[PDB]
Amino acid sequence: LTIGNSTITTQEAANIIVGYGEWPSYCSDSDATAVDKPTRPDVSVNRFYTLDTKLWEKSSKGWYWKFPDVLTETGVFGQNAQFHYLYRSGFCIHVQCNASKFHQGALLVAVLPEYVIGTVAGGTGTEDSHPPYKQTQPGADGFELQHPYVLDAGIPISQLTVCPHQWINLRTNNCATIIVPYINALPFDSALNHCNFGLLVVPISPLDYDQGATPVIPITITLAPMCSEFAGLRQ
Amino acid sequence: LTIGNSTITTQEAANIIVGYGEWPSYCSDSDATAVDKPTRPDVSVNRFYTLDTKLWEKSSKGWYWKFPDVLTETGVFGQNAQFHYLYRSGFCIHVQCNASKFHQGALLVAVLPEYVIGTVAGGTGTEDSHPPYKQTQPGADGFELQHPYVLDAGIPISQLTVCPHQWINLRTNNCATIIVPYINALPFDSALNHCNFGLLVVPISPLDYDQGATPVIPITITLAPMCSEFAGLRQ
Amino acid sequence: SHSTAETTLDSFFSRAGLVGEIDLPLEGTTNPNGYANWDIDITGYAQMRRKVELFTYMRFDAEFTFVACTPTGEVVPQLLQYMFVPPGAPKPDSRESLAWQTATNPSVFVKLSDPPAQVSVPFMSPASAYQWFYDGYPTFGEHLQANDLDYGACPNNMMGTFSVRTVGTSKSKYPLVVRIYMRMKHVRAWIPRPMRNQNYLFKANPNYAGNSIKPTGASRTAITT
Amino acid sequence: SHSTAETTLDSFFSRAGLVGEIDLPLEGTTNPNGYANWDIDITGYAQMRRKVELFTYMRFDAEFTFVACTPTGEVVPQLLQYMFVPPGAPKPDSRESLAWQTATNPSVFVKLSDPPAQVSVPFMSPASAYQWFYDGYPTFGEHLQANDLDYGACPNNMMGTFSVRTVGTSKSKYPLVVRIYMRMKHVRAWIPRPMRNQNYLFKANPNYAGNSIKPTGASRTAITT
Amino acid sequence: GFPTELKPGTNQFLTTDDGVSAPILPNFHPTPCIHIPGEVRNLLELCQVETILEVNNVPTNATSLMERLRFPVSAQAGKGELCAVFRADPGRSGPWQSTLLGQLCGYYTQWSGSLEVTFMFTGSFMATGKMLIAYTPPGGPLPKDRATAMLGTHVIWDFGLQSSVTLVIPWISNTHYTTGLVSIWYQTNYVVPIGAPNTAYIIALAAAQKNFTMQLCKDASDIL
Amino acid sequence: GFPTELKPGTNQFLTTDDGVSAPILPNFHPTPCIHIPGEVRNLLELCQV
Amino acid sequence: GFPTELKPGTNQFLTTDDGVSAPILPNFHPTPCIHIPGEVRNLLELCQV
């Protein structure tokens, strides 16, 4: 893939894995879904937007993101899609971790479409609900889980692999690349209001060093959205 | 049309519009509608009937006509349709208004098949009914509307365009010509008892002058009946 | 939803609607005789008139269903009589009238225990199509000046009428209620008209009020949404 | 056992499950009226919810069956009315509502003597497929922060609602109970999910307890079988 | 003879049940179907006919009830704001209830399609000026000003193209919020020579084009 | 007409019987089946992941 | 056996119903249709006399 500004080169072992087995496509619209024609080049906004890199402690318990969201005030992607009426796109996302040959651990990069992340509070002591407002727009840094075993959704990682996933074993792979197409009932919904998609990077073997060695492990996420769908509006 | 007495030359603006998409036809009777033969030369009755021209002031609110009736003591036609047993014809009617290019307004000439126009009185204070006399049998002179928004029929002009219509906007066209075929459940009904058909000429932008200009604007009606059908009776 | 099937006249009109609710108490204040004529109006299903006065001429068959019950809803072993009499044929006057035995008046005999009868009434008019309003006097020939309120109604638009009995020489045993549902089939319509905007006053003419209502107002001013 | 017939989604789903238990007593304090609206939840069959949360999006037609009896089980000579009203359509508020006579609301008249009514409801959603949970606030456009309990639930996943009456102007004579069974037909599903492991609290969000249980425990130690 | 098992739905009366029923008069041959010119076999034919749009849904007096089809332009306001045609959703309560389209949509539930709104100018022959019509898609609020509206879908209408101007809104849908907005702005003042009324009028009539489709039938009328 | 004898199983309601029932909305045409990428037509597909 | 749903109009007696009913004497052979000259098959022929 030599499309964009600067890449990050790998020895390209077959850690490549496509969402459900079929590539992200464009919209097949030479019929009548919209008489106005959204127009989209492959390299305008398909820049390699690399998020903030995050730390991995022993007591880290996994992290999640939402994707139509994550680009809002993020990149020229967010500066246009907020103003555009409708959105659709595939992704090439690269979760990359840099570690030593003395470190041991296990990460599980997995991909999940409709991610309803809960959640609950205490009980019925004072109030029964209050899910957070800041639940959407988790920043590149955010956010930590609460109960990773159930993904704060009452759903087990034990079977998380049933969704398109990919392993990062510091024994073998420090790099993983997974591609997802667009996934929705409608070929066009709006973006920031509905996050079509969620990404998880959760450790299973919770890492161990022997001290005197850098205790923090970088998990750098690198994104490249393919087959987007836009045109332009006002401001 | 160079068929008849005197014609009227026009620059043939895109005023052409046919009733419902079909030319007025004659009678097909090699079936079993009548062993009797209706008789009509093509040049017998096709004279250009121009009625009296009516005035259009700012306080004008529209007029309507009924067509089989309007010819009674009207023309040699009414002197002809009154004696016959059965009637059938389409019409080609030419509505022409002459105004200045300093005058402005907007007319909607429209034609309506079965036109039952009411009507009602006050309440139950003085009279409860009194259905109208000259409601049917409208002379050339008549008739003025009463409440144009509902065509005195509880029916909105807002959707009058659903019927065969044509606009006269003094911005562009001052002339309109519209053709109607025969339209009834029976191919032959009687004339003087039932007016199968109604014509409306309603202003929406009720004309405006700048004073010092003649405040009366003429809406001249001209009629030309195609495909009549008769044979002969007594006297 | 790329399909125009729900915009067909048939799909737009095909639905058994309640158009008749006939009450037969054991004895009471409705009809102490044990006998009822139902002139067959389509307007019984209220909204239907506007729904069909979209057009001038249209044409259809009619499939009627007869659900009869007690006012309680108790289903009861009663044997009753449905009679459809053609436009030409006369209507019965008494419970013991002869019209009930007149063969040319098609009759239906079912029990309430037996599931609702289901019949079809064809296109009865001598015209090519039904007609909702006649821009003329329904009198053929020279006019009579006795009255002139006889306006707009086309008389050969009557598609018959239905009559009901609790069969027998003696009076009924149970208080009964018959309901009639109308379904329109092979629909063909013709000349399209603008749709009604006022309330109706009478049920034979497009009459209106001495004060016009507006199909939408309260918009303040043209600038404010 | 070499056959993939019982591993198709259809065989996995083709079975009428009880989803409705509506009581219409002679009189009491649930609904003293003789009248009940039944919003059409599939969650009525308890286990079905986890059974369908195996996937994200799925799609099917639905065959409904209505068995009615007394709380005793006495089958009773009563004629009742089932009315299905679409998602858009309004629900009746009173027993004597006008909505019962509204034609665009398909209605069913059966007796308890008559075997249970059976109708088929097609795929209703304006979407191409159903959706069990919407990872967004269901408003298109700007967010409304007046309320935020409106989360995850997709409203056009609602496939209508059912209403029941004891037919008649007067109240019923007998105490009745209607039971509703749903069978899913041409089922096609899509995106696979891990299956639920904790208990449900609400029916609009996959919320869980403030203390996690374990989908299997009591294993003593890894060495001992 | 022939064996049979009766199945549920037996003896049931379904209002929308479509079957062939017992004919009451089987020997009867009805009056023949002769050809009558204007005929409809689909309501969309009606959904596609251009009909008047009551933008000026302001006055409620029968003497001023006619003012709704019409909406004015005058030499008073300059380069400012004249009129938004309000929401661009026909079946929704508003100006569109005047259109035939808006009414038949009231006989259904949710729709999807494209609309075109042709505007007609009724002023004098000698009048000249400019108007820019600006559509504002759902989600995006009404453009603050002219300069804000120009950066989007908009058409500068001059009375050189006097006859009309057709504005086609691409796509609208009902998915059970915020809808499309059409705004009409004074690009410039209504200039006239002497002898012309310092005020003129516009009539707006609209319809849906051919990709327009509708949903399930639903009834809600006026009479009771 | 065509002679018929009712046989046992008449008027019986079987929860798992596979028959065609009366359609509630015979005029209704649902939104089209557009292609959604990941699809399952057999649960065995899950047994293999 | 063969599945069936009974529809409304069931058990109804319609006076103008055109059906074939059970024959009372199926083995009976009625006297043959010998030819008698003047015959009418339609009432309109009378309308023309």
TrEMBL record, chain E:
It is found in: Host cytoplasmic vesicle membrane; Host nucleus; Virion. It comes from the Viruses. Homohexamer; forms a hexameric ring structure with 6-fold symmetry characteristic of AAA+ ATPases. Interacts (via N-terminus) with host RTN3 (via reticulon domain); this interaction is important for viral replication. Interacts with capsid protein VP3; this interaction may be important for virion morphogenesis. Belongs to the picornaviruses polyprotein family. Protein 3A: Localizes the viral replication complex to the surface of membranous vesicles. It inhibits host cell endoplasmic reticulum-to-Golgi apparatus transport and causes the disassembly of the Golgi complex, possibly through GBF1 interaction. This would result in depletion of MHC, trail receptors and IFN receptors at the host cell surface. Cysteine protease that cleaves viral polyprotein and specific host proteins. It is responsible for the autocatalytic cleavage between the P1 and P2 regions, which is the first cleavage occurring in the polyprotein. Also cleaves the host translation initiation factor EIF4G1, in order to shut down the capped cellular mRNA translation. Inhibits the host nucleus-cytoplasm protein and RNA trafficking by cleaving host members of the nuclear pores. Counteracts stress granule formation probably by antagonizing its assembly or promoting its dissassembly. This is Genome polyprotein. It comes from Human enterovirus 71 (EV71).
